[model samples]
Target: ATFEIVNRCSYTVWAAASKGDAALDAGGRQLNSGESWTINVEPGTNGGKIWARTDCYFDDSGSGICKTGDCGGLLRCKRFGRPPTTLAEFSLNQYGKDYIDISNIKGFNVPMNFSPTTRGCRGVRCAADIVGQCPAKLKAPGGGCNDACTVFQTSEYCCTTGKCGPTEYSRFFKRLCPDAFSYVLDKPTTVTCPGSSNYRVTFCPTA
Candidate 1:
């Protein structure tokens, strides 16, 4: 009979098998990456079953992360047949985002990179004129030493005369301020507003 074996992992593998109840080491050997080997087998002195086994190793990520339940560990094997038995087959995700494990089959390993794509920011309108137009009821900070007095500031031109209120300027800042000023800072950080503090802002921190 003829014996054919294939190695699917990124590294080489060592294969060996028995033809029957006999105990002769057979001494099969290494198969390189993406390589295959064929051999001849003779009927055993005492007719029984043909048993085979194999093992493999990688020089770079030696033995990979193999564990009892881990998918990337150790070499394994299974019997061959049509619609191969569950133990005879194994698969690893091409993207490396997923993995597989079988009782008797060694798993394949690959590298992957994951990062989000970038998108440009959307424009805004009425960004200027955010500090003018104070309410008439509140007096300006001038010629007075009263701490109890309260003041209200406005950025938009009030539709009704003599009234200090918010304008469409805030709408633009709300929509674009997040996209324009969002980022990560490692050391001490400080930010300054363009016109006035009347606009809303968003801040996020990451370590």
Candidate 2:
């Protein structure tokens, strides 16, 4: 599958896509507002994660810390970066279908939309003022909001055991982004599209 990642944020973002130890687009690229990058994944690419890093600075050798979604201070991430990140997760060509979803389980740094470009499939978006509406306890240090599980690490929030449910924190996130997976157990948000479809991942999506 091919993905066109677009940045519409007012500021700069470094986009990262990874599945296992493999990194796409040479790990990532600095995307100024209105810029876009394209990446391709092979069939059966499961557990893939794509997100944007904010307030980043990478030198000649590509080593720096980002305020959000920094992957071990490396420019070309070899692993999933730390969050306070809005994520577009995908599993391609599984059982002849592609599964995609926009997840805020790590909390949100930017609004996002993940949709097919070539088909009639509906897209999913989490384009709300989550940062502005973030509850005090779930606020991250930077411009991103923190997920309840990340902040409170309890059984209720983390779902470590068999029993867990939404809290006020998850509800806050869910209220703003109805199409996204606001909590770990959030259901029916994943969309399945034909394996042949191409997709777009937009950060700070307006529509």
Candidate 3:
């Protein structure tokens, strides 16, 4: 049999599992970022534990920025008694995937190619450096300030400076995927500033 997870929170939810009924470790081997897993349940087997955490904050600083172990909060499977039959569902009253998507709903322009500096690296720099120094560059008119140079020189710098600029994904998303996605920096979910959006975007699988 198979099961599906529906995100019912205002933000994105990540799922994790453990072998035993150990106290949930916020810093242990757990999954986040709306991931799903499948397992075989045999007859007479009555117990298992599934855990979920939010992907909208940095656990170390308690900031609403997505980081290694900073899921907003913890959701336990025991709260619902026995898991569902045929299908199991988890719910978050304040956070889920829709929340993450809505949080990232902003018009941002990021760079496609840029350089990496010790003082200004925001993951986008790696993409920028590759595009800037890649053998096959993105071809555009003039070729001077094309997508490569603009992204590398201007947009990458802007990201490091905490200023929104053109990003490779943003440019691609805007041109090729105009109605699909947007971009942001390390946005915090727990904190909202006046006139400031409470969502920040970053690359997944960050170490």
Give the best candidate by lDDT: 2
Candidate ranking (TM-score, best to worst): 2, 1, 3
- Selected candidate, larger lDDT, 2 vs 3: 2
Off by over 4 Å in 1: 19-26, 44-207
lDDT of 3 at 140: 24
- Give candidate 2 regions above 4 Å deviation: none
Error of 2 at 164 (Å): 0.8
RMSD of each: 30.8, 1.2, 18.5
How many residue pairs in model 3 have overlapping backbones? 23
Clashing pairs in 1: 66-73, 76-104, 77-104
lDDT for every model? 0.23, 0.87, 0.27
- What lDDT does candidate 2 reach at residue 157? 87
- Candidate 1 least-lDDT 10 residues: 198-207
| Candidate 3 lDDT over residue span 1-207, tens digit each | 122222332334444323234322232222333333333322122222232333333345333332211222333222211111011111112221111121111211112111111222221211122123322343222111123333454555335466776556445434442322234443322221122112122222121
- Clash count for each candidate, listed in order shown: 3, 0, 23
Candidate rank order under lDDT: 2, 3, 1
Q: Cα lDDT for residue 140, model 2?
A: 85
Estimate, for each residue in 13-32, the C-alpha lDDT of model 1 and write its tens digit.
34433322232234234456
Measured with C-alpha atoms, the lDDT of residue 40 in candidate 1 is 46
